[PDB]
């Protein structure tokens, strides 16, 4: 074990030296020529009311109109964001839902949490109401995130420090991703859905290739638990929010932190991050009940989406980039433009 | 407009369903149940997946306890799910080299957690009979895990249990005073600690919770009126 520890230390030094050689400058020192976005006077256009407890999670539709939101009162509610109409209301067997996903085809939703189970609910039922279509059991830690790759293949992250890729039809784990030592709090599928980055409570964000299930890279630099992660829209970069009150954009192809978004008065942990459709704005939900829109290239705070009465727990940017949806522990989901 | 009418009909049905569900949700008090395995927490669960929901009721009042089993001992993330619960029933394993000090540290972490700073904590010193057996036999040797117990004295407000040895009373009230030292330090009335002396098979365990829950609710109302 001592020999393995020494080898691991030497490999860590080699990786650190390789990252240092590949990075003599940060994102800001290269993006001096890009135009600052100025103050983003983003404003609330809709407020989705009807959740009783703290929305712990929400997910948009691919149509960018319907969105699924999860409240820890035990509710999975689909909102027609345009007309603020609830499309479906799904009671949950486990009230403690910590994650929800909306299938890209829109036929299905997923939710999970302290039950460890990823419940897949079918929307387009012949019976006329949402039923428990499938249950994915097999995680031994709380289910912190879940994302559909398609109608049948879904990737989930759990508190058991492992991620699991499931075939929904059979209900069996197609692949198990392991290597995190902290509670894996979130994951994000790449635009090609071939790669996915998951941040854990070990201050490290691990990128996995879904097909074979190996941890391709382990980006480090965060000081505390990573609670939020999302790919940059090109799929060649991602961002993480951590309890250290700093967001960090990492390159996949540079294996290290590209930029850090932080401010001295910000001493609260980012709870949710999401890029705008172009990736110029990184929206991050903070515990101070506010969301900060960071100009992801100049790293300055472009705007503040103040208005939430409690901790911002989730964000989602529409696939067409028209609107943001921010949920919060105040039981309310504000749509912003 | 026909599609909008159908959508509005479905939305109104959903809204009336949610209004119906809100009555049940508000009438039911979510309670977190926390503690180590040796604390007798599962015994209290029996007396009353990665979470074990227990719906029970006192005087036609619904409590929904959540015994968090099948979860990693790294509590710092899923614990945040329980900020809005009525109370956290923290059961301690009094009688890990020093399990009691670990319980004290966990209670301190809960008390000073920025999300649980508004969440009340009921406290159960579960192993009172076993603590008595170990103190009277000299096997607990709490005095070495806590040197200040060599100078601690039974407080004037202490009410001994019927037939309880003075050493047992001194030990239990020392434990309570340690936990109240943690709680009162930076308590600030935003949340309240309710220590109790209980056995594993005590049927009072529900009432001591229920009353405290009532108290918590009452105090919350007063905090809403700026009366406290």
């Amino acid at each position, epitope marked *: 074990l001592d020999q393995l520890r020494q080898e691991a230390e030497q490999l860590k030094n080699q990786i650190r030296d390789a990252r240092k050689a590949c990075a003599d400058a940060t994102l800001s020192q290269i993006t001096n020529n890009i135009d600052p976005v100025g103050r983003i006077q983003m404003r609330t256009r809709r407020t989705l009311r009807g959740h009783l407890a703290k929305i712990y999670a929400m997910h948009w539709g691919t149509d960018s109109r319907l969105l699924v939101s999860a409240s820890q009162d035990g509710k999975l509610i689909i909102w027609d964001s345009y007309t603020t109409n609830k499309v479906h209301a799904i009671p949950l067997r486990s009230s403690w839902v910590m994650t929800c996903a909306y299938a890209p085809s829109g036929n299905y939703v997923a939710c999970g949490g302290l039950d460890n189970i990823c419940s897949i609910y079918n929307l387009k039922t012949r019976e006329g109401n949402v039923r428990v279509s499938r249950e994915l059991a097999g995680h031994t830690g709380y289910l912190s995130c879940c994302r559909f790759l398609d109608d049948n293949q879904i990737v989930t992250s759990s508190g058991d420090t492992t991620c699991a890729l499931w075939d929904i039809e059979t209900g069996q784990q197609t692949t198990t991703f392991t290597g995190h030592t902290g509670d894996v709090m979130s994951l994000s599928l790449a635009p090609d859905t071939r790669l996915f980055v998951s941040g854990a409570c070990d201050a490290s964000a691990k990128l996995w290739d879904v097909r074979e299930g190996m941890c391709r890279q382990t980006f480090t630099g965060h000081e505390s638990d990573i609670n939020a992660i999302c790919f940059f829209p090109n799929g060649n970069a991602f961002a993480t929010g951590s309890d250290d009150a700093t967001c960090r954009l990492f390159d996949l192809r540079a294996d290290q932190e590209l930029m850090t978004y932080s401010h001295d008065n910000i001493i609260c942990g980012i709870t949710s991050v999401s890029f705008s459709k172009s990736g110029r704005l990184l929206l991050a939900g903070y515990d101070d009940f506010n969301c900060n829109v960071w100009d992801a290239l100049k790293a300055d705070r472009a705007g503040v989406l103040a208005g939430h009465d409690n901790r911002v727990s989730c964000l989602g940017v529409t696939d067409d980039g028209m609107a943001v949806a921010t949920g919060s522990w105040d039981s309310f989901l504000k749509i912003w433009n | 407009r026909n599609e909008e009418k159908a959508q509005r009909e479905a939305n109104k049905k959903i809204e009336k369903q949610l209004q119906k569900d809100k009555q049940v949700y508000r009438a039911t008090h979510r309670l977190l149940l926390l503690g180590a395995g040796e604390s007798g927490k599962n015994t209290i669960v029996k007396q009353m997946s990665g979470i074990f929901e227990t719906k029970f009721q006192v005087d036609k009042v619904n409590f929904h306890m959540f015994d968090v089993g099948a979860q990693r001992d*790294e509590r710092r993330k899923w614990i945040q799910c329980f900020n809005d619960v009525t109370a956290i029933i923290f059961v301690v394993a009094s009688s890990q080299t020093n399990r009691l000090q670990a319980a004290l540290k966990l209670f301190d972490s809960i008390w000073n957690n920025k999300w649980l700073r508004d969440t009340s904590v009921i406290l159960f010193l579960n192993k009172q009979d076993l603590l008595a057996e170990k103190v009277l036999a000299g096997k607990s040797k709490i005095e070495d895990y806590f040197p200040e117990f060599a100078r601690y004295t039974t407080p004037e407000d202490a009410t001994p249990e019927p037939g309880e040895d003075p050493r047992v009373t001194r030990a239990k009230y020392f434990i309570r005073d340690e936990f109240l030292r943690i709680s009162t330090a930076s308590g600030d009335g935003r949340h309240y600690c309710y220590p109790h002396f209980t056995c594993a098979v005590d049927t009072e365990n529900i009432r001591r919770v229920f009353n405290d829950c009532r108290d918590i609710i009452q105090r919350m109302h007063l905090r809403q009126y700026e009366l406290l």
Partner: nanobody
Amino acid sequence: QVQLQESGGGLVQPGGSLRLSCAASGFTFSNYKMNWVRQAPGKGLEWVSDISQSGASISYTGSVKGRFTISRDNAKNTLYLQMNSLKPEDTAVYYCARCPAPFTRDCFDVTSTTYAYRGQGTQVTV
């Protein structure tokens, strides 16, 4: 990467003295409350002592009250445990455990089996 390296542990005769030094790296040491915990042979990770962000607040487990002094040098980004009057039951692997979140008074999970922000541990045999 959050790294905590303990050093200075070693063989000490009973009733002797020793000094455990924790070198911290990969994080702003001043912002984090720090802890010493110990894994005794055949026992779970007992928590030994903790010190606040600035060092103004200090607490010990009972068995080391007065015996050991915890301290932190924020300038050198390091933590110290000056150990005195060592009894044989102090023989353990000492882990320098950082609290998870900065600026927070709570210190969840430092005694957990696989806590992340914890050092490799230094052996102290008495």
